[PDB]
Design an enzyme around this catalytic site. Sequence first.
Site: not given
Lengths: 313, 313, 313, 309, 313
Positions: B11, B13, B78, B117, B142, B150, B174
């Site tokens: 998604q 990418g 991943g 990512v 990122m 958010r 994160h």
Amino acid sequence: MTKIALIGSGQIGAIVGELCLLENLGDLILYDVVPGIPQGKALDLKHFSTILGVNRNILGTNQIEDIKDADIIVITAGVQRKEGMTREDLIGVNGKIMKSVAESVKLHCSKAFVICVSNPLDIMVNVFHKFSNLPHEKICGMAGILDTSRYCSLIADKLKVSAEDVNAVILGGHGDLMVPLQRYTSVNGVPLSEFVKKNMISQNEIQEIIQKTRNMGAEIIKLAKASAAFAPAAAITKMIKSYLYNENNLFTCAVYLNGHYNCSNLFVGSTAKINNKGAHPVEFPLTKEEQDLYTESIASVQSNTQKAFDLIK
Amino acid sequence: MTKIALIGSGQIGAIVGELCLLENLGDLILYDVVPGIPQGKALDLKHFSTILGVNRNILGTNQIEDIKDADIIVITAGVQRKEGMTREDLIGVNGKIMKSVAESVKLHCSKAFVICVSNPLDIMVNVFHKFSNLPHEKICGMAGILDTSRYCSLIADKLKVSAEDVNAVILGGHGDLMVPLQRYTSVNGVPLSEFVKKNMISQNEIQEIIQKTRNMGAEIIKLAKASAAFAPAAAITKMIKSYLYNENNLFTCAVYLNGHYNCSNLFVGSTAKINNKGAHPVEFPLTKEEQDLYTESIASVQSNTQKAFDLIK
Amino acid sequence: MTKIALIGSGQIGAIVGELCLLENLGDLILYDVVPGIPQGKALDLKHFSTILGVNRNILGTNQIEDIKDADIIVITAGVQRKEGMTREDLIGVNGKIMKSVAESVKLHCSKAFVICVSNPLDIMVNVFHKFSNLPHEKICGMAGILDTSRYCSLIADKLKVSAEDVNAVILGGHGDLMVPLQRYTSVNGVPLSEFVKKNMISQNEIQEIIQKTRNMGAEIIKLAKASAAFAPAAAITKMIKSYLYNENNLFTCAVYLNGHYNCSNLFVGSTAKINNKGAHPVEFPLTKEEQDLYTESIASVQSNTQKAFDLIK
Amino acid sequence: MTKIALIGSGQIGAIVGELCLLENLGDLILYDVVPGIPQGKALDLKHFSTILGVNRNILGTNQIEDIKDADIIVITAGVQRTREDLIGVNGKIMKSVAESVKLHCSKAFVICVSNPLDIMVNVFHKFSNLPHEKICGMAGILDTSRYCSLIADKLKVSAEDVNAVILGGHGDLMVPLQRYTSVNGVPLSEFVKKNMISQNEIQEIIQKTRNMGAEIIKLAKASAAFAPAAAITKMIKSYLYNENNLFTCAVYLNGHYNCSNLFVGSTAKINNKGAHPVEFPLTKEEQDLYTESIASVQSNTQKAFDLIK
Amino acid sequence: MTKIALIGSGQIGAIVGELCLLENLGDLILYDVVPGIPQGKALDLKHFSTILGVNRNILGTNQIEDIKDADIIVITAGVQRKEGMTREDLIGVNGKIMKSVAESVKLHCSKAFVICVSNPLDIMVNVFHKFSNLPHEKICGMAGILDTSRYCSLIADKLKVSAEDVNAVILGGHGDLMVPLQRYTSVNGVPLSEFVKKNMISQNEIQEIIQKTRNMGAEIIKLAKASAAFAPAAAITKMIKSYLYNENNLFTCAVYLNGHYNCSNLFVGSTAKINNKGAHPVEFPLTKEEQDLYTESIASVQSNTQKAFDLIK
């Protein structure tokens, strides 16, 4: 102030919503039958909007009455095909869904302009018209801009030119019976026939390209294990734009034919303009052979439409 | 001439590829381990390009050697977490995948700038540095831009203002130990503290917002049944743009700390500038309490990064 | 369907028209008093539109009644200052022109949102309100976004950072009495005061920057031999966008104060939100010293506004 | 990293600079001979860039040596507007600019815009010593936008996918090709068969296309600036992004359309490597008209070289 | 802790002091120029206080410096008109007195809220503002509440209803040019116009009532041989209460206009709210004919205010 309603929050719907946000086309209403899904994608789209400095409103909902006063409706609700299936195999399950959506649009926002995308495309446009009780100009389906993009793309690659100004007309149903018109293919104005005379491309190479164009939808399914989502959404967004901004652009899409191309009382892929008032077919002078091919495509759509109306009882 | 290599064609990418095509950032190389998937998404992206008048080259591939001479590398390869899982549950399976990608980048394009990512984000950045043998400024992850979007989005909603110029700094990993800084939150220049004094927002409302920011990733998974894709891709693109165009923008992202914020030898979410030469941390003066919270977040990242190295044997 | 009317077809008006076409904001009505000028610029703009694939309608006219039903009105009609002149020197000649334009808007499109740009800016907004009979939230003037862009641009240069997320508040009249607020200046959320503590910029360097911001309008006149056109037009377009798209962005612009900042019954540069309903002031808590400076600016605007009303008889 | 040098900071140059900034094409170098003008427009442009969130570098200068290492050069230097004086005054300016590009950035791709266009492209080539694919002039795109715009109006269609080929010099001897006009793929001839437009209406449109540049001067009291700048940008884009787009522009012919050793308006592709002509099969009558346009350009180009001594 | 200072210990001042005691509004400072008079009224008021169980402090003084740190100031100092005189005949003698009081308030208690009552009312408010150097929201004059009571009282009598919930707006100077607004007259919410439709009152009866309202001040002087004292005091006390208790009540009183009702830079009878921060004008939408009448009243106040300033030298 413009309200754009996405009936279906799958891949296509979300990307259409993403493209609408990028050009500030309107506030979004993301509708799906499955709870939670539109609310979650709405959250992701808001955060997207915040990073890119877009400020339009985005509402994810399972209440179809939130579609009220939508100026635009994009219908992707329905099932998609898998490997080995044809588009037509969805006829039974999607016809029923399309009828239900038609009934909801009928009572909640009868003034909207409606772009249908559920497969099989041409058929499902006819179903929507039958049960929606909207004027025929206010309903259309996207396909021809997608099929034209694939055919132009391939023509561009073989001629070693930019796709940017390769234009073409593809008539007929979004399926194996498409009719790409060589006569109505140009490269920044210059007819495709010039490039055959200059030996830059051969009639056989063109027939090959027409075949790839036909199968392309299946080829992506086979490779990506999901059906094309980015190109369809871009096409849709282009048709939304032409309506909102009264552009009067000349596309191919599924539209109500009414004496045009020896066909009447059927939505099928054809040359049309889109503006403020909706989608309006335009008839161009075909050769006998061209028209014969087109009529043959129109016959499948006729048959499969009837099949659909039958399977709905 | 710029080559952007997307290692992972899921998604995130694909949408990153999409947004790169929209701004003409570069030619795309879509890589995945699973055969066919990149080739199909490349086809759809080509057609998308044709409809929008973008002309960059797009290549879908399973041969990682095609990544050669990429200027930019985006790693999404991943597994993603499902409902009920934490990002940290992926440590075992994604560490191994990140190492393999590291090794490939090492031999095929050692001069690239690398945006990681894969989750858990900070941890996987540290794995990629270890096995890639690239300079630390040429690697980052990122996250902060997403978490910030958010948090700012929620602040904007409560204050009844445009999110467009709500800016903020979020430090740390994160995950549940993010440290949003109220002091470093502004609305078109005006500090957040001015809005508390004016009674337009309360300290409790802010703590509520911080909690929703922390759980947002999980909330979207719960609602949408898939993890966030659009906002991550937009954040990624913004970091690509800052590198390609030498913009020197000041973000929060996973970056190599080196005596900044009492931390050394670890990639972790922090204030950084991105330009031509890579990602460069910048230290701002924290209060004792702020730094304490930040150090605590840094500690989890430390632990879990060790865990990840251990579990790779 | 949106109609944008440019009252004045000079440099600024034409570029505003250009930008509005670039973002598809609306159909353009280019008005000027001088015959042939708007018709010619309209022809150029249509051709520009064709090259870039924009399709909005563009009408060049000398009949002010063509302004009917404009949703948006941008007023640049008036004389510009030359080298050595202050903005206030135009008070006599531009007050009379502004009154005439006010009268015309009054009878032809009373429902429009009106952005005044003729100098001296704050004074002319007050003149337009007086003779137009429009609600005070539907009238504003652009200046603060321009001054802020200059001040932020200079701060960004000195700090070696992207201007992209340097934000600031500048209060007061568009003139030598602007009040840039260091407290309300941030770099992607981080207050300007953090950069002084980190020795990346000094209090003297900031005062220097404030001075350059004040004189900037005159400096560009001196160097370019014409007054700034591109940045003003961008600012204007940003305010149009905020109105059309109901963005509720927080800017500085000339806005009707009504008990805010110890000021009532005057249009003057202040912090305001722009949305669907117009320009709405917002009061932030100033220090004594800040408010004192702001009140001093407000006093000039008061005096000069009276002067303008007097000179109109 | 890309450096775009605008040799001339008048109306056209500034708006080109504006459009480059809007698409992040590159760092700008604004050059002009008149002191202060470029510096001032550069300041405005920086403020414009701040408001719109663009971050590219902008330098206004009067030192032509600042053009060094420009990847792209746009030339608008020269006077806008006895014809032996135009060709007379701008030829000399173009030669001087050629000489400067020669010593300071010989690797640049050069778009010429000074009038009379075609003639001036040939002057630039003669004194610049740059490969002929690295030099071109914009004009076709502008004339095509005018012609397509008028066709679109008459047919009540979007101009967006009206395409056309216009051959020949940027002047009264343009050759618009009806055969190479289409509306989203459909040839113009189909619309004449359908009676949506007449052959006379088309001739009318061709005439308005030919006189447009004058009509705008008459009405606006200044020459067109927004459309030219958009055209130029479109060519810059095609070069920088290796797009290989098919335009009409002034380009070095070499056996194409029975013409050799001349820059003239013709069908060409622009990519990474420059402007490359492409020959399409013309009818006798079409080629005759085109040759006639090519003869003027030849004559006047000779005239220009002569007047430069 | 609240200090209320009565500058003038005549009939009105004493009664105001009485009412303030009855509601425990504050400690009193009774000031007059004439020795002994305030002390003696203070004694009587203490004894009054003892009988009624009120326990606030009361100080009768001839030393104006005792006004220090008053929260409220009521000015009744000045000469009252006799039979046959207009309020405007006092202009010479009272302007000089008002100036002197202004100067005293300036040096002794610049933070007070000031209610002016000396005639001619509107004019003397303008004199006080000029020489006092207090913010314009901290100064007002009572008149409208008195004129309104009179008009409402007469309307109530003719309709055979309680005066208790008859409300009205009277704009303009406290004089022969008052403008009572029929449109803004209601009887416990029901507009006056409903009673004319029901034939319970006629347009002529209303004009009669307006005339009696105008002359009422003179009629009481003629009958009682002294000017009204109880109603003026009640009105004043109502304005004190609204300030002390931050009530934000909407009255008519002499207030600083600043672009409201096409008037600027003048104190005149208008619709205003009184709270913690002072008196704040509010503009309501008048008809042309109403505004014309109001402007005519404003003109007299303008003229006579100038006359007053002139006569002060």
